[PDB]
Design a protein around this ligand. Structure first.
Ligand SMILES: Cc1cc2c3c(c1C)C(C)(C)CC=[N+]3c1c([nH]c(=O)[nH]c1=O)N2C[C@H](O)[C@H](O)[C@H](O)COP(=O)(O)O
Ligand SMILES: Cc1cc2c3c(c1C)C(C)(C)CC=[N+]3c1c([nH]c(=O)[nH]c1=O)N2C[C@H](O)[C@H](O)[C@H](O)COP(=O)(O)O
Ligand SMILES: Cc1cc2c3c(c1C)C(C)(C)CC=[N+]3c1c([nH]c(=O)[nH]c1=O)N2C[C@H](O)[C@H](O)[C@H](O)COP(=O)(O)O
Ligand SMILES: Cc1cc2c3c(c1C)C(C)(C)CC=[N+]3c1c([nH]c(=O)[nH]c1=O)N2C[C@H](O)[C@H](O)[C@H](O)COP(=O)(O)O
Ligand SMILES: Cc1cc2c3c(c1C)C(C)(C)CC=[N+]3c1c([nH]c(=O)[nH]c1=O)N2C[C@H](O)[C@H](O)[C@H](O)COP(=O)(O)O
Ligand SMILES: Cc1cc2c3c(c1C)C(C)(C)CC=[N+]3c1c([nH]c(=O)[nH]c1=O)N2C[C@H](O)[C@H](O)[C@H](O)COP(=O)(O)O
Ligand SMILES: Cc1cc2c3c(c1C)C(C)(C)CC=[N+]3c1c([nH]c(=O)[nH]c1=O)N2C[C@H](O)[C@H](O)[C@H](O)COP(=O)(O)O
Ligand SMILES: Cc1cc2c3c(c1C)C(C)(C)CC=[N+]3c1c([nH]c(=O)[nH]c1=O)N2C[C@H](O)[C@H](O)[C@H](O)COP(=O)(O)O
Lengths: 207, 207, 207, 207, 207, 207, 207, 207
């Protein structure tokens, strides 16, 4: 397989719950192991803007998502926001790529300043210190200078700042096709196969 | 009327031609005068990703768009990329708000460094020096540190960096509803009435 | 009316509860709509240093303050610290000016770094990104370099840093007159009429 | 004795003459020697906002203040604004702590940039170069970014930026009690005994 | 006595609970008064990596530690994480030196940015603003650039960054001897007598 | 094999000779080729704080260490401090990972500023310019701001700053177990198998 | 006694050997213990510009200087440039103030960047990390921007930059009186009694 | 002639009046035209530390100095501190080199920030803007970070920062020989012949 075997997927409280669910689905279909993390604000967002009835506590959540995605047993592990015994909490853990999608402006700030106030924030802190991949998917508009300075600092340290800014150049016919654009971008960044977004110009030889 | 009477609307070569067309339509419906500017790369984008057959040269383009939008005569003025005699070229012009939507990473850079290589770039330069409103709508992903540093510098000087990052919290049913989200945000930033995106929490009194 | 119709007034855990109460009273007397926010530490401060018995929960608090100020029904809206459905949480809300008075060093930091950990902090973050007025009233002494760097960054972005530093040049006779000095300054900054602090030198024509 | 035997107390032209007079009184009561310096603008402030009739020239001023405070002969030395032969002008002088209270934004600037235009400004310059204590008590509101950058630079070099921002948590009953709060803070910073502001939590053992 | 009479000792959630316990023991043996603070994550660390059964709540914790160390009554005061009435919360408190040992990357960040979210973080903020001693003992590896920038900013402001990096040059025979090395370093920094680590080269006169 | 086939291991004059010896032993056991470099101060440290009688000159040193570690012939190459003909001196050499363990504050400085005064310093300079892995293991306490600024600059350029700060969370029973903690961290950073430090939380599925 | 009991006095290769000799003499007369360090370039300077025939090696040098100054036995300790076992090499040593007089531009640079290439440079590095006094006495003219940036960085960290720039305001009659001016300044900075330079304005009471 | 025909020589209020007088004498002996400027504080310094009885007003001062130096008529022009009609006030003047000797910390600051408060300060401002030579001769000790940052900024812009720091390597026998060292350095910097300080190593061919 190309790309990482294990991905820490954190969802935080920005608009765009559909991006996180769709990415979790694609990762499951590519037979990757997923350590799933979700913030209390992200649970509110998912309730407000989708019809997914996600259980509150980690054990019921893991059952639910395993079903929702057609996953194998043990494929999705769910960890709570203060579970410091979970792999993402420590750099001595086995190597994982991490994606925060969506990434709230609050979580962006926490990762930029090193706040480490919960498992999501600490797991990003660990990714940076161990130089493991870290992809942040913000959804906000306008971006203030506070937002931008946080993104610049993280990008300069090697995090990939991938905003939820879909392109329109693959004939999108629905909301799902825009969601897939961004998910494909994330998958390309991780080095994981995807077939939702073609390789640009791959058949063009000259002109 | 609340908001500016005249808006310079520049389209540049990022994905998202639909955002620029829809904004031009809303501005026409709110009876504003629009100075329309379009880059050569943006004409290619519009050809690639829409079915709008926009004429190449300014006089035919102005006729075309006046028709496309149901505009009054003289309501849309179109200026070419080297027309230094057009109002946006000089700070001695009458006051306009300016929006670059979509805003390519190339145009972002040119405005940040002050390159002024064509009328779009000079008009932004003039907006900044006269402290008139300037809203930039980038569409790119990932954003590199070069992109981010250009956005931060412009935001620190008072430009509004409004990425084409639609939210999902008003029950979007189509691509058009995501386009409208971003257009509504732009209109709110200019202070121009819109009824596509409700005012958040306006009916919530307590809890 | 001159000045904003709606003001988000946040109280946070610095000394100076009287400044926040007096400002809320003046805003009510000028017929403005107030979105009132209060932190858990600020509730402790108000208990420690005043005799106002403010109810704990938002609905009882709103009744209490409506009475305390002689307000009209609906004039004061109170929102809890995690009520992400309230208007100040989103930039899609209708435009409000925001004042944080008093502003703790913790809240100053959170706004400077973009932490957005509760509604007060997120509402400031939204004010900055939408370029709506934001006035911060710190009360601390000494100010360390951490405090000062947070204030400088926010002032450079356009926040008004208005410390609770009353002047003595209008013959103050009581603690209430010093409180009124600072409140008048805040009201002048918002553009809202006040008659507690005269206009300096308004009758002086020459010398 | 704890704290310095000699204090250079400079008064400059910000509101808050009462803070400077009260501090001079407390220092005299603690049997310290005071080198008293006062700017021409501060003399105007004292005339405008108090009823103290301070003589203009140094010899008469020294007599006046010696009386006003109940000081011993020689306890208060007064030096004029161009008296380069006075101890505070040179780093070869005996060690003194310096307090500028109130500290105008002009004097803040002069000390930050090293202007040394009069004895007050040079004495601060000497304090910094000899690493002797320097406490600045500004009274201004709002603080601009110019003010804040001057304060940050001085704080980073080890000056104590102590704004005239009294707290309300010791049951203040009058203007005099707010003045005493700030004076007590200054005295605590110098390490000089005071009994106006109790030691916080000194009797609290647990909870 | 040389060194401070009162030390605020805060334990936070990094590996190295033994360093904090041993320092508390040495401070008790040198007859100092200790204000003991402990974070919720540090309680988890102590449970995971030692056999000390520390009670959860402050009153039982104070009894426990008084016993564990052979302390006098009142010698160890324990304060909870939201006890804003305890001495370390305010700069008006009596002077204490503060040591955070171990110091988590989260607590490092909070002190660097001024977050003040709990008593530990506020007490450090107060130490810096009052220019009282502040010693931070991080335990992490690798240190990222976020960690390092937080440490540099605090060191530039006068905090002592003392990582839990024991030396091997005093013939260490056990884990306890490495723990004692770091504790001795902390005690030397505070100016408090210790006899675990000899004075280097004290008997060497020439060569 | 996972990880690099060749490692340049440099020892410099900080406390912690045991870390460098143990790492050299683990690298030999994993069948890697090691280019061993040692400074004159590090030879003094090893004499002072261990019982290893390391020969002075490179040929005798190579024989000695080959024996000490059970290495194959040619597995350990030793190069002197001015041997500019050795592979690590030039970027045209075959690719190696480099570890400086322990890393003195002097060697840290030299690498940060680019001094290149001996083979160790030049080999690090070459690692950075060719973007090959570079891991620095400092042992010092306190770290001054000079130390920290040197570490930050190198970390920002992609060096891994891994201080000799062992954790206590794998039940350490001896000095050797603390040494192994840090060595395991270094091996994890290089991507080389180790079984001294388990993978955190690897068996934890939920909670 | 006021001031430190032990002073590390380092001489380095700038013009002004007489300043270093005279300071060593005054320190001996004030009964302080001196750890004397001298660079190879400073030995050349002393040969070139004085008639002091200083022995080359430390044991003979210590005898020589003990005689030259009228010191007690053991009062002057001399350490060679690579004697890492001497007290100044380690922060675990007993506390000393350090003066580098004269301070070459090379030694200034080494201390600023943390090079630690010999005992003088390491002893300064240790002074900074332990926050012990460090006074640098450069003699160079012009100062380039490289010199100035090195001095600024060290001054910002708390080193005292005291150039060999004598004043003329105490009626100097000879070269010795100019040398004494600078030596007195150094002694004042250390807090050690001296009677060569009077206290400025000490008898001036008013004007 | 080598070097400039006209030199603006400004004296300001630092110790070292003898340097300025001696330079004026050497410039007269080399037949240069001198525009002489002197501050009010420098007149006080000259009264305090020399026996030169310099007349107060410019016309009498010019007569006096013409005599003191053996100058030709018109060779020394003296201009008062507010004489904006004198050549140094404007960049349209004929080209002159400027030397401020001695240069007070106040004048250093004024030139660094561009204050231009009197003819000396404006003449330096003009030198910098026209890129004419500007040499500043400070006399202060210690130099604070404020001093150093002012010197660094001016040196980075091309001013020569030449402190009054004489060397001892040309067998100085008196105060006059130290004064001549610095004057020779200034003359070398201007490119004007001098024979007080030999050319170093001019007769050394090898070793
Ligand atoms: C609950 C809530 C919070 C929104 C939010 C919404 C809700 C329902 C929406 C969907 C109705 C409107 C859009 N919101 C966004 C948002 N923050 C942000 O960066 N982008 C957003 O798009 N916020 C704020 C965000 O959740 C917070 O500031 C939380 O403190 C973040 O905490 P977290 O990082 O731990 O998830
Ligand atoms: C023509 C072309 C150019 C794209 C582009 C596309 C096409 C059709 C798409 C739609 C197929 C794929 C997306 N593209 C984007 C893009 N630049 C950018 O910032 N965001 C984009 O989304 N570029 C590049 C951009 O047009 C250039 O770098 C031009 O030089 C910009 O010139 P302009 O600012 O004057 O318009
Ligand atoms: C409860 C409490 C907290 C004080 C405080 C007091 C109390 C009663 C006083 C009145 C007795 C003494 C003064 N205090 C101030 C203070 N922080 C600050 O910036 N200025 C203050 O004047 N603090 C600290 C502050 O409340 C905190 O650090 C909280 O974490 C801030 O949380 P908040 O921003 O959410 O309100
Ligand atoms: C005379 C005068 C000047 C005030 C002033 C007042 C008066 C009476 C008051 C009391 C009526 C209103 C408040 N004022 C303040 C003030 N500057 C400042 O930083 N804070 C102030 O509170 N200023 C300005 C200040 O005095 C100047 O800018 C002087 O140039 C400062 O010179 P100084 O530093 O040498 O004293
Ligand atoms: C509970 C827990 C948290 C560890 C931790 C461990 C556990 C048991 C160990 C011992 C098993 C592994 C090492 N850990 C460290 C750590 N943070 C850190 O900076 N260094 C550490 O050595 N963390 C994270 C840290 O506790 C957090 O990010 C908390 O949010 C910090 O909160 P605090 O500052 O309020 O204590
Ligand atoms: C010889 C010697 C030098 C120690 C030292 C010791 C000795 C025996 C010890 C073990 C007794 C005490 C601790 N020391 C350390 C140290 N430098 C440092 O960064 N950390 C240290 O732990 N130093 C200083 C260091 O060796 C120097 O400054 C050398 O110039 C570094 O040269 P190098 O980088 O080429 O090895
Ligand atoms: C030997 C030598 C070196 C002089 C020197 C002289 C000699 C005799 C003089 C006395 C004839 C002329 C003046 N010199 C000075 C000088 N460096 C400097 O900063 N200021 C000086 O005044 N240098 C250079 C300085 O010694 C070096 O650059 C050494 O490398 C410094 O090494 P050190 O810091 O270890 O002493
Ligand atoms: C009058 C006076 C002022 C001294 C001074 C002296 C006197 C007699 C001495 C000779 C007795 C002691 C040394 N002093 C120096 C000094 N400033 C400085 O940078 N270096 C000095 O060496 N000062 C201060 C300096 O003159 C001022 O701060 C003036 O405001 C500077 O104004 P100027 O730049 O316009 O000359």
């Amino acid at each position: 397989m190309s790309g990482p075997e294990r991905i820490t997927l954190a969802m935080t409280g920005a608009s765009g719950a559909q991006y996180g669910l769709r990415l979790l689905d694609c990762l499951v279909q590519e037979e990757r192991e997923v350590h799933f993390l979700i913030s209390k604000a992200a649970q509110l967002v998912m309730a407000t803007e989708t019809d997914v009835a996600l259980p509150a506590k980690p054990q019921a959540m893991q059952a639910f998502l395993t079903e929702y995605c057609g996953a194998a047993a043990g494929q999705i592990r769910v960890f709570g926001q203060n579970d410091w015994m979970a792999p993402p909490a420590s750099g001595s853990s086995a190597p994982n790529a991490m994606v925060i999608c969506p990434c709230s402006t609050g979580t962006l700030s926490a990762v930029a300043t090193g706040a480490c106030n919960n498992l999501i924030e600490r797991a990003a802190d660990v990714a940076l210190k161990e130089r493991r991949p870290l992809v942040l998917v913000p959804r906000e508009a306008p971006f203030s200078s506070i937002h931008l300075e946080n993104m610049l600092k993280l990008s300069n340290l090697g995090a990939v700042i991938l905003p939820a800014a879909p392109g329109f150049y693959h004939q999108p016919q629905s909301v799902e096709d825009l969601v897939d654009f961004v998910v494909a971008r994330i998958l390309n960044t991780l080095g994981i196969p995807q077939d939702m977004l073609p390789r640009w110009g791959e058949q063009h030889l000259v002109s």
